[PDB]
Amino acid sequence: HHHHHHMVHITLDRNTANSWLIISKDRRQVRMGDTHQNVSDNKERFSNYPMVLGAQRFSSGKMYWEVDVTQKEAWDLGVCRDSVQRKGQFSLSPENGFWTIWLWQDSYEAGTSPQTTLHIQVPPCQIGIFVDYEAGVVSFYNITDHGSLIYTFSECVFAGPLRPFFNVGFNYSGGNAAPLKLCPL
Ligand SMILES: O=C(CN1CCCC1=O)Nc1nccs1
Ligand SMILES: O=C(CN1CCCC1=O)Nc1nccs1
């Protein structure tokens, strides 16, 4: 792809984080802590899952960023509406305001309803995410495999400002402690 020149500097919004997450000083990395991280509750925090938003909001244009997923067993990545539900249980779907892919139990899937199987021959260590607001497109690229396409959501109905979306996943296995990292431009 030739989307690299729309690169944007994403940082994580601490106030949206689940209370067990640890965000680095530079706001470019996030991992699951082994306990509550001693923050106050607020209406922005994702309560049920290890999720956090980017601080940036997008309502126009083309945007691109990259995320490092090295050595993780489970994660979700993409974009979501600013107005997505934060509390309680929900599914990741465009009807609920999410345009995402994930890794879970050694398979990759797109967050459609129901979920869609992805076909990835080279397990990615870094994911590229491209949003074209006007076109209604969210695309995912395998940086480890020469930028090969993973998935495209089209005819998207964003219906509001978009935020970068992250889920570091639970660590029940002891094998999913590694962080998500926003990669340098
Ligand atoms: O999105 C905005 C402002 N907007 C709209 C168009 C571009 C821009 O910068 N403000 C919000 N405040 C709280 C929720 S969204
Ligand atoms: O779901 C959509 C479009 N829609 C319908 C409801 C909200 C929204 O964004 N596009 C897809 N592209 C690939 C698989 S689903």
Ligand 1 in reach of 160 Cβ (< 6 A): no
The per-residue b/e assignment along 36-59, b for 16 or more CB within 10 angstroms, e otherwise, is: eeeeeeeeebbeeebbbbbebebe
Ligand 1 in reach of 4 Cβ (< 6 A): no
Stated in angstroms to one decimal place, the resolution of this structure is 1.2
Give the whole-angstrom CA distance, residue 28 versus residue 123. Answer: 22
Alpha helix (H) residue ranges in 27-136: none
For residue 52, report the distance from its CA to the centre of ligand 2, in Å. 22
Residue 30 CB burial class (10 angstroms; 0-12, 13-18, ≥19): buried
Experiment used for this model: X-ray
Structural tokens at position 104: 């879970």
Give me the domains of the chain, ranges plus CATH numbers.
Answer: 4-182 (2.60.120.920)
CA atoms within 13 A on the CB side of 131: 27
